[PDB]
């Protein structure tokens, strides 16, 4: 097997090419910009409707409605401005580890330990939420499935595979197979043409929703990447791992720009999201509290400590007006 | 204020009442977790009861509703979803006693028990350890000595000794012999007493949970 000799030299060539493009560091460039100061964000809402531990959430493009999944078999659709429950969709399998909100708002989705993330119809006659489709075909727990549009949806399962679906058809039109560990997160680019995804091999990748080929491959973590989130510009993305370290990567330089680590932080990250502008890096940890990293100088700005258990999900509204955190405490805070 | 939002608040309160009502129905149920290494008798204990990622199995015995989650159909990293089954009432564990001479699979089952017994989530969760295929263990214990999987066996190669040796080798894997229990039962196809044994262990676990709730324990 002399073909593996090409792989080693190829990896060295990749590491050398990006090393030559590493002129300066993001710390040196942003060493001449004023910091963001202490960012004190207090709780505005508390959404108390779940009985088990909340495992996921996702805002709507209206930045007012948010879905949330939990292990008690319910998928509630909150109204954040008034804490009202707009729907409460009972799931056929209470082991749900992800949920999504269609950009238009006519559908939601949720999957888990049943290898299926099923699309629910919100805007329909008969005034009840009804399962539109049940997208089966994965061979492992579904960790994240996000909506491209009302008719397509990308998933990412525990069988080291991400797949692009067609809701009206129900068949994987494109399957992305390049990972060696199981995929644990996912995030769509603003233009919804590329997307990155964590894994359990400390390697996030970059795919194309139309071609299906792995564009680039980023590494540098020491443990399983738990979360991921695209920079609002679409040319960078942060990650979250079990080594208690977030790091902003870069699709242009093909390498990480900086790393957000603290000495008194030892628990893994479960959730990562940016802000509307892109200066804040909201990261939810197993320490029961969500930290706030200034995403340009890598200094901890503030702390969002209001949960009584591990924070498992995190989302920032599409207008940046609020930050919703959901913990195993069964409560879903909304900061501002 | 609240012109048409009064009816929205009323609908929210109605589905909140429905959530509270559906959460009490799922609290009076006993959730188990059927683990076990491959090729174990775990597919037969589901049939000993009343009975594609995980397959729930709902059944009722003596006015007690059991839910048994068989998670063997997921050949992925257990580290990344084993926290979903936290707070489960008990952990059933099927171990084939007739696999001590097949392939060192008994040591695989032993290390699996050590991993899902000293797990950071199942510290207080009791374990109902079953030992299936007792008849095949009977038939294969007289000719195949225990020295294959346990060469340090100092004793007679009879059933009442070697079976108890396996029982104490499995029971000597929890470093929390004060907080958690391990109910062992040399099950078989005899008289279907497995449901009664699971009911007894689950009743003890429920008594302990009630004691923790009322502040006594």
């Amino acid at each position: 097997d002399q073909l593996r000799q090409e792989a080693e030299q190829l990896k060295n060539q990749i590491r050398d090419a990006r090393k030559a493009c590493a002129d300066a560091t993001l710390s040196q460039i942003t060493n001449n910009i004023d910091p963001v100061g202490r960012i004190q964000m207090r709780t505005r809402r508390t959404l108390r409707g779940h009985l088990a531990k909340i495992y996921a959430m996702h805002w709507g493009t209206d930045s007012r409605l948010l879905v949330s999944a939990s292990q008690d078999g319910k998928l509630i659709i909150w109204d954040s401005y008034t804490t009202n429950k707009v729907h409460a969709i009972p799931l056929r399998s209470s082991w749900v580890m992800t949920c999504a909100y269609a950009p238009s708002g006519n559908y939601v989705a949720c999957g888990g330990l049943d290898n299926i993330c099923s699309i629910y119809n919100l805007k329909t006659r008969e005034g009840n939420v009804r399962v539109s489709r049940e997208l089966a075909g994965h061979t492992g727990y579904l960790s994240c499935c996000r909506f491209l549009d009302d008719n397509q949806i990308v998933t990412s399962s525990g069988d080291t595979t991400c797949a692009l679906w067609d809701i009206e058809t129900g068949q994987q039109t494109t399957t992305f197979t390049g990972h060696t560990g199981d995929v644990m997160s996912l995030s769509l680019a603003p233009d919804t043409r590329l997307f990155v995804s964590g894994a359990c091999d400390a390697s996030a990748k970059l795919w194309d929703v139309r071609e299906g080929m792995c564009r680039q491959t980023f590494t540098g973590h020491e443990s399983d990447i738990n979360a991921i989130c695209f920079f609002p510009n679409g040319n960078a993305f942060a990650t979250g791992s079990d080594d208690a370290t977030c790091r902003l990567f870069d699709l242009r330089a093909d390498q990480e720009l900086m790393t957000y680590s603290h000495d008194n932080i030892i628990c893994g990250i479960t959730s990562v999201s940016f802000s509307k502008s892109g200066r804040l890096l909201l990261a939810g940890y197993d320490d029961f509290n969500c930290n706030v990293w200034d995403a340009l100088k890598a200094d901890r700005a503030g702390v969002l400590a209001g949960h009584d258990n591990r924070v498992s999900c995190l989302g920032v509204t599409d207008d940046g007006m609020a930050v919703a955190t959901g913990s195993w405490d069964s409560f879903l805070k909304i900061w501002n | 204020l609240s012109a048409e939002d009064k009816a929205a608040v009323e609908r929210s309160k109605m589905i909140d009442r429905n959530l509270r009502e559906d959460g009490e129905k799922a609290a009076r149920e006993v959730k188990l977790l059927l683990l076990g290494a491959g090729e174990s008798g775990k597919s037969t204990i589901v049939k000993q009861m009343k009975i594609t990622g995980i397959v729930e199995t709902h059944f009722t015995f003596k006015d007690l509703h059991f839910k048994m989650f068989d998670v063997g159909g997921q050949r992925s990293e257990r580290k990344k979803w084993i926290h979903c089954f936290e707070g489960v009432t008990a952990i059933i564990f099927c171990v084939a006693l007739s696999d001590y001479d097949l392939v060192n699979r008994m040591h695989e089952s032993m290390k699996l028990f050590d991993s899902i017994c000293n797990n950071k989530w199942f510290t207080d969760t009791s374990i109902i350890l079953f030992l299936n295929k007792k008849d095949l263990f009977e038939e294969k214990i007289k000719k195949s000595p225990l020295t294959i999987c346990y060469p340090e066996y100092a004793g007679s190669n009879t059933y009442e000794e070697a079976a108890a040796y396996i029982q104490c080798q499995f029971e000597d894997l929890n470093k929390r012999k004060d907080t958690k229990e391990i109910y062992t039962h040399f099950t078989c196809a005899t008289d279907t007493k497995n449901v009664q044994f699971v009911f007894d262990a689950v009743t003890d676990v429920i008594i302990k949970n009630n004691l923790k709730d009322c502040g006594l324990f």
Partner: single-chain antibody, 232 residues
Framework: VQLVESGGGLVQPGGSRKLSCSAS????????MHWVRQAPEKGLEWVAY????????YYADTVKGRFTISRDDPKNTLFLQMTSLRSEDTAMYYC??????????????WGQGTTLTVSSSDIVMTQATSSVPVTPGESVSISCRSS???????????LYWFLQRPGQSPQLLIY???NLASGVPDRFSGSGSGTAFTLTISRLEAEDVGVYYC?????????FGAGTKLEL
């Protein structure tokens, strides 16, 4: 979706009669139901309303005490037990459906209606032009002025627009003054602000003949308008 009523006929004044609206085709238990009557040659008029779970009931100022309303969720039936009828209650009684959450379209589906005949502080909507002529292809502009600013503090200006074609029941066109109803062509478009509303129709087509009522849903009792009729 279906809403059929039954219990119509001639009734002597002072008597009693029960109207039953039997729903079939939707989750009746989750919709708040209304009763809306219409005199033989007058506009619509609100009567009663039950919420989901019967936890809230309202009546008008003419049927309070006389009429009582009730729902049977397991049987999917809506009742209006009428007592002490008068010579003014002669009207077709419509069974209306209405669900209330963020982004809902209440008053979406209207029933067919009975033909009950009895032998012998509110908000006032005003539709000035009670009847105007119109030719296909032309643009119409119906107006409806309220006696109180409907624009609420949360931004939602509650004003609904209905269309009752000749021979049918009124269907929903616009809800909350801006939102088109499902299954309604994009020709219709509501505009206006508080106390001054308008329903502009562009590139008019056939089957648009009928009466156009403007209901306010700011507070009970809900009030309709006189109704502008379009003549060919």
């Amino acid at each position: 979706v279906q809403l059929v009523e039954s219990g119509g006929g001639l009734v002597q004044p002072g008597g009693s009669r029960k109207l039953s609206c039997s729903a079939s085709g939707f989750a009746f238990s989750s919709f708040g139901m209304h009763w809306v009557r219409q005199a033989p040659e007058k506009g619509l008029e609100w009567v009663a309303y039950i919420s989901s779970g019967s936890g809230t009931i309202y009546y008008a100022d003419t049927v309070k005490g006389r009429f009582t309303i009730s729902r049977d969720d397991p049987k999917n039936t809506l009742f209006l037990q009428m007592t002490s009828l008068r010579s003014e209650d002669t009207a077709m009684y419509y069974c209306v459906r209405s669900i209330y959450y963020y982004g809902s379209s209440p008053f979406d589906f209207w029933g067919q209606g009975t033909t009950l005949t009895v032998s012998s502080s509110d908000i006032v909507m005003t539709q000035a032009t009670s009847s105007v002529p119109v030719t296909p292809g032309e643009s119409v502009s119906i107006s409806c002025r309220s006696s109180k600013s409907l624009l609420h503090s949360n931004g939602n200006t509650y004003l609904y627009w209905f269309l009752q074609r000749p021979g049918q029941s009124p269907q929903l066109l616009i809800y909350r003054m801006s939102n088109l109803a499902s299954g309604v062509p994009d020709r219709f478009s509501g505009s206006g602000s508080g106390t001054a509303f308008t329903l502009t129709i562009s590139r008019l087509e056939a089957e648009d003949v009928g009466v156009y009522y403007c209901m306010q849903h700011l507070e009970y009792p809900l009030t309709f308008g006189a109704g502008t009729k379009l003549e060919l």
